Amino acid sequence: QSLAERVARLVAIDPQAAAAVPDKAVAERATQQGLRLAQRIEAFLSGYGDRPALAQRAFEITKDPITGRAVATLLPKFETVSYRELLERSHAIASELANHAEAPVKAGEFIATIGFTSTDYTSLDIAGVLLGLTSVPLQTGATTDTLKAIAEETAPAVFGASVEHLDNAVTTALATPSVRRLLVFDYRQGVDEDREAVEAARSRLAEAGSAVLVDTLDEVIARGRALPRVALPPATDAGDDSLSLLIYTSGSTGTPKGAMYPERNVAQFWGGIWHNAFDPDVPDIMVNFMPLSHVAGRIGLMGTLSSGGTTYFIAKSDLSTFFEDYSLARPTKLFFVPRICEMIYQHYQSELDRIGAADGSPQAEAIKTELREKLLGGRVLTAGSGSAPMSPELTAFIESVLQVHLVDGYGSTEAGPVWRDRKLVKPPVTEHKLIDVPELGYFSTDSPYPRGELAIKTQTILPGYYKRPETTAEVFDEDGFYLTGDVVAEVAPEEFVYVDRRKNVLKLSQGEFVALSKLEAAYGTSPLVRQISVYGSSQRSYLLAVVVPTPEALAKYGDGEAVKSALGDSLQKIAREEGLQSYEVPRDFIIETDPFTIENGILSDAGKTLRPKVKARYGERLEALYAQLAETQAGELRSIRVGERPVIETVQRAAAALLGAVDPEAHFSDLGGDSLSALTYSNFLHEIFQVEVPVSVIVSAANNLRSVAAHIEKERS
Ligand SMILES: Nc1ncnc2c1ncn2[C@@H]1O[C@H](COP(=O)(O)O)[C@@H](O)[C@H]1O
Numbered sequence: 001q002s003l004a005e006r007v008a009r010l011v012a013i014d015p016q017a018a019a020a021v022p023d024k025a026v027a028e029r030a031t032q033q034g035l036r037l038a039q040r041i042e043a044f045l046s047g048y049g050d051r052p053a054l055a056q057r058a059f060e061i062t063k064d065p066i067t068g069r070a071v072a073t074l075l076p077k078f079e080t081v082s083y084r085e086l087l088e089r090s091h092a093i094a095s096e097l098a099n100h101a102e103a104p105v106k107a108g109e110f111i112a113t114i115g116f117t118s119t120d121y122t123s124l125d126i127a128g129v130l131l132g133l134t135s136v137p138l139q140t141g142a143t144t145d146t147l148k149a150i151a152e153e154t155a156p157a158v159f160g161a162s163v164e165h166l167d168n169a170v171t172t173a174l175a176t177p178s179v180r181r182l183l184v185f186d187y188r189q190g191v192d193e194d195r196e197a198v199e200a201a202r203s204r205l206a207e208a209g210s211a212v213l214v215d216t217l218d219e220v221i222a223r224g225r226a227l228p229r230v231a232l233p234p235a236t237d238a239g240d241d242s243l244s245l246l247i248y249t250s251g252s253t254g255t256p257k258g259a260m261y262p263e264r265n266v267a268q269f270w271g272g273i274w275h276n277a278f279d280p281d282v283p284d285i286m287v288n289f290m291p292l293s294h295v296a297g298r299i300g301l302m303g304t305l306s307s308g309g310t311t312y313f314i315a316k317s318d319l320s321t322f323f324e325d326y327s328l329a330r331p332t333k334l335f336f337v338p339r340i341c342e343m344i345y346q347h348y349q350s351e352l353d354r355i356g357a358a359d360g361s362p363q364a365e366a367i368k369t370e371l372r373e374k375l376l377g378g379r380v381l382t383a384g385s386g387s388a389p390m391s392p393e394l395t396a397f398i399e400s401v402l403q404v405h406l407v408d409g410y411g412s413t414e415a416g417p418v419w420r421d422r423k424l425v426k427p428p429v430t431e432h433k434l435i436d437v438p439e440l441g442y443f444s445t446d447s448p449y450p451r452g453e454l455a456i457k458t459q460t461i462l463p464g465y466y467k468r469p470e471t472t473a474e475v476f477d478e479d480g481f482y483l484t485g486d487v488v489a490e491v492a493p494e495e496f497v498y499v500d501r502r503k504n505v506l507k508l509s510q511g512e513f514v515a516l517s518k519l520e521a522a523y524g525t526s527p528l529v530r531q532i533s534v535y536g537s538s539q540r541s542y543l544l545a546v547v548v549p550t551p552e553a554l555a556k557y558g559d560g561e562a563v564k565s566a567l568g569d570s571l572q573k574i575a576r577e578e579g580l581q582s583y584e585v586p587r588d589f590i591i592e593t594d595p596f597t598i599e600n601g602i603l604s605d606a607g608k609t610l611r612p613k614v615k616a617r618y619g620e621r622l623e624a625l626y627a628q629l630a631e632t633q634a635g636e637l638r639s640i641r642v643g644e645r646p647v648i649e650t651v652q653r654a655a656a657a658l659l660g661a662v663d664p665e666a667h668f669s670d671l672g673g674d675s676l677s678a679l680t681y682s683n684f685l686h687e688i689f690q691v692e693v694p695v696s697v698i699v700s701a702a703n704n705l706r707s708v709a710a711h712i713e714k715e716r717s
């Protein structure tokens with residue numbers, strides 16, 4: 001019943017879980033007062049000895065008989081790396097980098113890295129801490145213009161990259177004269193495609209006459225194993241105050257700014273105060289799907305290392321192996337972002353259909369049982385979400401599936417953890433207040449509950465944004481409070497509810513900020529667009545916009561669904577051109593034929609669109625668009641019940657229902673879902689056509705919707 005009883009019962013009957021329980025003595029040695037980060041990390045990892053620390057899906061290599069090329073294919077199991085092995089491989093990397101013949105790194109230099117999350121990436125991250133470097137994890141979805149800007153600002157000496165991202169890593173490195181070495185990780189020896197991507201990087205660097213040196217991570221470790229360990233602690237300038245990490249975020253300004261993490265703040269991920277974001281000693285077996293560059297990726301991964309647990313890494317970056325991985329790893333602790341919860345709920349609606357059951361009926365309850373017991377692996381003891389708000393209906397559903405309480409954890413890159421199930425986390429938060437936002441209509445005198453921007457003093461507050469004292473100042477008031485940008489309602493002494501943002505950047509259900517004003521500037525260059533105001537709700541997974549089209553567009557296409565299609569195609573292409581993410585493409589529009597103007601109240605005296613006025617005039621209609629699609633996605637029930645139409649038409653119509661917007665020639669990617677949309681599409685078509693419809697056939701750039709139909713037809717034969 002209670003958590004402690006549930007834990008005691010799992011450890012009595014499960015040998016794998018029994019072997020993973022935290023050891024109080026290891027945490028006591030590692031977190032002792034005054035101990036430097038590097039040594040803390042060393043004490044956790046050496047302390048947990050031969051336990052399995054990390055697990056990667058196993059694969060096999062076989063010679064393709066048509067092409068001759070050695071290809072890798074996933075196996076239905078995981079292989080593990082021990083705490084001892086992890087520590088030893090990380091030390092090897094530090095030893096090799098400190099001792100390189102020509103470009104030895106020193107403490108305080110920067111290392112930039114682009115990868116997903118993996119055993120290798122984790123090695124490299126730890127090695128940076130051992131050397132006293134400052135790490136700069138870069139977002140795998142950023143454009144090379146953004147990567148170059150961050151690299152120009154931080155001047156890294158070493159750049160690391162997974163094989164998947166190597167080509168963007170070469171482009172950045174060529175524009176960044178400080179880079180002396182390029183390290184290539186997640187490299188599979190004997191796999192032809194990996195070997196070729198490294199050869200092509202070397203050619204590009206050759207052709208440029210670059211002095212940059214390329215090494216695989218394997219080779220670096222091989223070399224380092226033969227060298228003595230570096231001395232801890234490393235020779236940095238400021239002890240605990242030494243700059244260990246930069247987490248780039250766009251929340252406070254709309255473009256990336258480098259949140260400074262000294263070693264004393266990074267230490268909080270390793271068994272420190274971030275324990276309490278979510279909150280009896282539980283064995284920690286976790287599946288990690290979050291990039292290391294996202295503070296949530298680091299919280300999970302280092303939390304599990306620091307508790308002597310095991311992290312199972314999601315097998316593919318697209319997340320297409322999601323259920324397979326959870327069904328194999330069978331975690332005891334779940335952390336979701338709300339988008340994952342939406343996806344599980346969409347699966348549950350799918351299963352209701354397939355067995356033709358309804359509502360809360362007994363066979364509908366059997367679907368929840370198989371989610372909890374089989375698909376999610378049946379050992380979930382605790383669960384949390386965060387990064388974005390969750391509807392009460394989605395929370396109710398997830399909890400009825402898992403049969404455990406779903407903790408809501410609020411915090412940020414800048415502040416650390418701030419609340420747990422409404423209640424301020426003290427420590428580290430020491431004081432708070434609310435600040436009125438009269439332009440949006442929120443005031444501490446509101447009834448029934450005060451509303452305002454949350455402002456806090458907290459022990460885990462960042463010292464600044466790197467090299468950006470102006471941007472730093474904007475987030476601190478004259479009394480020393482950090483300004484979160486988040487509007488909240490207060491419902492009891494020191495209890496809060498997320499309501500809105502003070503400005504023009506917000507989270508969607510994926511947990512990533514979207515900068516409304518940047519998207520507006522990009523989308524405003526469409527020849528069809530006169531004015532555009534982009535709108536989002538943080539409980540949704542996609543955006544909307546209010547568009548005033550040009551007279552020529554309104555004349556050529558009219559003011560209904562066909563101009564919305566025209567606009568979609570135009571925006572989609574801009575998004576492809578400027579490297580925007582799939583979810584930052586508006587899915588549906590309010591077409592306004594009457595322009596925004598000063599007379600209207602929509603434009604200020606200075607000509608600029610006022611967001612609060614857009615909201616006051618179009619907010620209801622925008623919220624209706626969202627509501628109606630969420631109500632209507634049983635249009636799939638009618639797409640399934642046919643059979644009576646050709647393959648392509650079902651393929652089309654299916655893509656249309658899942659991505660809000662069609663045309664036979666489009667690519668599913670262009671159309672603006674996200675990688676979990678293609679998983680859902682894939683199961684849907686598999687159900688109907690009893691054919692395997694893999695995500696890689698659906699997402700690969702050279703495959704449009706006609707290739708998808710074509711694939712299904714060929715498989716059927
Ligand atoms: N549990 C939550 N509920 C609502 N919004 C959240 C929650 N957790 C994080 N956020 C939002 O995500 C931002 C932090 O983003 P990051 O800096 O990526 O951790 C916050 O300022 C909020 O806007």
Ligand code: NA
Nearest residue numbers: 508510511512
């Ligand atoms: Na998001």
